[PDB]
Amino acid sequence: GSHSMRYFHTSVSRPGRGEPRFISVGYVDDTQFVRFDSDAASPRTEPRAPWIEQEGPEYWDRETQISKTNTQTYREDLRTLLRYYNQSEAGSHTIQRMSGCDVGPDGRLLRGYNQFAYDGKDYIALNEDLSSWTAADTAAQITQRKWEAARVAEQDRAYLEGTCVEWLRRYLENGKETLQRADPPKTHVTHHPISDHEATLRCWALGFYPAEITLTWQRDGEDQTQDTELVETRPAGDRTFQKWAAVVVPSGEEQRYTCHVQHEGLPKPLTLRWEP
């Protein structure tokens, strides 16, 4: 189906504890494939998936230099935002960036991204047109004016339409065994009495890839969104993901509840019930 590539940058200041650390991680869909950490004893862009290991020395050397230079740019940006927000040099602050591209089944560009946050709040984002910016506040409007004057969006657009989509297509081919394989969820329902009056029904999904899934409970065919406890989808550590959804049911009414599972790996959505 459709696929994504994303790079996640985090830079965090630590006044009195040296210079801000910079981390860059890269993903294709829900698979991490590269990392760089400026706090490592010998910072280097390193492989994190088997299918990227085949890239030659020039790939590793070029990406390492890019991340070493980006480390410095983010340190400059942290100093800049202390000025733009009238903040002291005493506190710790964070800049984040997410950038990348989505492609369809034919490998054509669906959309690009280049967006930033300061202290966990939106700062500036490239709009979907890849030609204009959304600034969150008057500080980000200063960056917007600077970036409009320098025609930054044109340069970001060229990377997102060219390099990003070309390398994502290459990675998808090189990693086709895993990146292009959906693992459906293994599902079951558990039952636990809470008291003489109620019991919990928990619908499990395990071992699935990619992470996107829909897990819902119905009571007499009606969605129980407000009454369902739904945990965040979580990594198992073997590439796959897990999720559960639970409902508290009146004793003796268990068969009125059905669990519904939708996932890319399933040709047809599943319906499950507690099977005593």
Partner: peptide, 9 residues
């Protein structure tokens, strides 16, 4: 593949 940041804030 990721490129250099285009420009500082």
């Amino acid at each position: 593949f990721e490129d250099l940041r285009v420009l500082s804030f």
